[PDB]
Each structure stands twice: as C-alpha cells, then as structure tokens.
Design a protein around this ligand. Structure first.
Ligand SMILES: CC(=O)/C=N/c1c(NC[C@H](O)[C@H](O)[C@H](O)CO)[nH]c(=O)[nH]c1=O
Lengths: 260, 96
C-alpha cells in the first residue's frame, strides 16, 4: 500500500491574540505524528505509537532544532515581506515529504508558499528551484548558489525521508497497515416530480483511499461526489449520486458492485 | 487571497432518534489559520466538545474536526457556528 511522510511549517507575522507565530506538524498519511509551536516551544508526539517507540532524547533534540527552525522561518518571512513591500500579518508555509509507492518506487517534494499561494518548488532531479515571480526568483538565486545544501536536500528526500517513513510505518502498523472495509448501500428516491435520485453511500472504511463510480449497463457515465470525510473514530465516509445502473466501489484490493 | 471555510455537519453513523451517536463538524479549505468553531444544541453552545488540532493540506489551506457525543431527537436542532476573517458575522450551519 502507498504511504507518505510529510512535515509542514506555518509562520504568521504580527499574529492576532491566540495565534502562534510558528507551528510545525508531521504526518504519516492522514495521521498527525509530531507537533511544535512557538507557545509551548516543545516538540511532542501526536500519536501513541510515536510516543511509545521514540526515546525521550528524540523530543529533546527536535525541541532544539524546531526552536532554530522557528527563528529561521521568522527571518525568512521578514525578508519576503520586505521584498513585496508588505505590512501587517502575512503567512509563510513549508511542506516537505516523501512517498513510498506500492511498486516500491518513491517520490519527494519540498515546497514553499507565501500567503497560502505557491512560491518556490524544489526540483531534486535538476537540483533547482522553481520560482512563481520576481521575488521568488531573487530567493531561488540565493538558495541555488549553495550546491552542497541542494545535494543534502536531495539525499534527505530520497534516503533519510524514506528511512524515517519505513520506521514510522513499523511503529504504527496496527493503525496504518490495517484495513476496515466499507459499509456501502444504494438508496433510490423520487425527488422533483419525474426525477429519481440514486445515492451510493460508503462509511466505516479505513484507509480513506476509495474509488466510487456509477456505471450504466456495465459501461461508464453527470455524477455528484461527496468528500471523503473523517467520521471521528479513525474511519471515513463518502458518497456518489446520479439521476441498468450499478455503483462500483474499490477499496484495498476488493471490488464491490451494487446493482439497481 | 483568503479562502472561506467549507463547513460540513454530519453524524459519525447513519442517524436514528433515541440512539447515541457523534455529531461532526468538518471545517476545511480555509486560509489564513485563525478560526473559531462551536457546536450548538437548540442555539446554545455545547460545553463538552472535542476537536483535532489545526491541520495542513497540500494546497496550503487548513482543516479541523469538531465533534461531540449526542443522542439525536426529532425536536432537537444541532448546528455548527464558525467564524473566520472571510466572514462578516459567525456562520451557523445546520445539521440536515
Ligand atoms: C522527527 C521529528 O520529531 C520532527 N521533525 C520535523 C522535521 N524533520 C524533517 C527534516 O529533518 C526537516 O524538515 C529538514 O529541515 C529537511 O531538510 N521537519 C519539520 O518541518 N518539522 C518537524 O517537526
């Protein structure tokens, strides 16, 4: 099964009461694993399998790194605001991560956003930065001049990130490698006079990755889709609607057909 | 560019009156991060309300889950009240 490891950083300049000027959260797939903010100034686990398998020295060392990353983000957001001639509260974001695909191949990404919009995107295959505008192009020229840091980043995305993900996958296997099949039902109902609505609803499934589609006489085809929503108990819910019909649902190597 | 939150109000399990359940409020796709969320029973704030920490999407927006244990009735009205910089006043989204 495909799995991913991601770490986000959020920097907020001049925050209003009750908003940290820095937050950093890690995820394995859709599960929070680590947290840090400028109010607690502590790196903490956000999953019991993370707390149980990592020695206290982990959180002590990452508390210090995160305190430094916080200072770095503060200063980069100031240089960005000065480049754009911006005052007031602005946001700066980072997302780093990797994916272990089901065929065993891997991916890696490192991106930056300014005010919730794309800003800089790393290309680890050419060791270059993709800049969205003149400001980002100024930043990219500085960052691209440090060759060893580009090589470090490639190594981190391709080796270090995959090695951590494999470790965390083993720590949280009873959660992450489990499968809870969906509960799927089809519901028919005349809505507007002469109009019949077909609803295909799925719930109680884990992982959230599911494929839902309506077919007509065994072949394809105006479908409405519902978002994959968390049910609050670790499982998810979703739907698809239309107006011989069959709902097709694919989840964790099992195909399901619900004929009308 | 500010993005207004998507507010979705649904029960953990297919609802039935008289049977214990969980009412969820999923607030997503919002930017910036500051948001206020409350669950309401017949217009009043529910005290025992649990929630997830602020979460991060790949498109740079944020999401959160607010939930509470509840036993739905035919007479009781439930909603999710949200406030964000994109909203002039707090938005009350009813459980349908
Ligand atoms: C293991 C842990 O507890 C938390 N680690 C964090 C982290 N480490 C990944 C890279 O080591 C790092 O991005 C580096 O800058 C890549 O070059 N990155 C974060 O952003 N926030 C974190 O909380």
């Amino acid at each position: 099964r495909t799995h991913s490891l991601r770490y986000f950083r959020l920097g907020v300049s001049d925050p209003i009461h009750g908003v940290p000027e820095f937050i950093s959260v890690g995820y394995v797939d859709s599960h929070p694993i680590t947290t840090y903010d400028s109010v607690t100034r502590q790196k903490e686990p956000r999953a019991p399998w993370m707390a149980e398998n990592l020695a206290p020295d982990h959180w002590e060392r990452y508390t210090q790194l995160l305190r430094g990353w916080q200072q770095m983000f503060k200063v980069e957001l100031k240089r960005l605001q000065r480049h754009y001639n911006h005052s007031g509260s602005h946001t700066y974001q980072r997302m780093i991560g990797c994916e272990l695909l089901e065929d065993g191949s891997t991916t890696g990404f490192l991106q930056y956003a300014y005010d919730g919009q794309d800003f800089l995107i790393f290309n680890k295959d050419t060791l270059s930065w993709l800049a969205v505008d003149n400001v980002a192009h100024t930043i990219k020229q500085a960052w691209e001049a440090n060759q060893h840091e580009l090589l470090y980043q490639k190594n981190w995305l391709e080796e270090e990130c995959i090695a951590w993900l494999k470790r965390f996958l083993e720590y949280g296997k009873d959660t992450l490698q489990r499968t809870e099949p969906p509960l799927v039902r089809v519901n028919r109902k005349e809505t507007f006079p002469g109009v019949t609505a077909l609803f295909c609803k799925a719930h109680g499934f884990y992982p959230p990755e599911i494929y839902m589609t309506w077919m007509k006489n065994g072949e394809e085809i105006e479908i409405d889709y519902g978002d994959i929503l968390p049910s609050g108990d670790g499982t998810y819910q979703a739907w698809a609607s239309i107006e011989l019909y069959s709902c097709h649902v694919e989840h964790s190597g099992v195909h399901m057909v619900l004929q009308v | 560019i500010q993005r207004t939150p998507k507010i979705q109000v649904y029960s953990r399990h297919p609802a039935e009156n008289g049977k214990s359940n969980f009412l969820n409020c999923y607030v997503s796709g919002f930017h910036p991060s500051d948001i206020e969320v409350d669950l309401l029973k017949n217009g009043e704030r529910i005290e025992k309300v649990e929630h997830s920490d602020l979460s991060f999407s790949k498109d740079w927006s944020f999401y959160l889950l607010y939930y509470t244990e509840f036993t739905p009735t035919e007479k009781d009205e439930y909603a999710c009240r949200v406030n964000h910089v994109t909203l002039s006043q707090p938005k009350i989204v009813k459980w349908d």
